Amino acid sequence: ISLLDAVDRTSRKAETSAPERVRQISFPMMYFKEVESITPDEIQGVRQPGTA
């Protein structure tokens, strides 16, 4: 928006306003992956901490 400029009455001149402005955008997003594995060699023979 802007302020109107004064014009004289007899010379019937006027003012106009600029139109709107519309654009477009897009968004990419991140992907996360996590892998873990359980193998019996990490369970066999191993001792539970805090237990005799």
Binding site: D8, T10, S11, R12, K13, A14
Partner: peptide, 9 residues
Amino acid sequence: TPTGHSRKE
């Protein structure tokens, strides 16, 4: 015309 065709300032 709305803004004045034959009128000049």
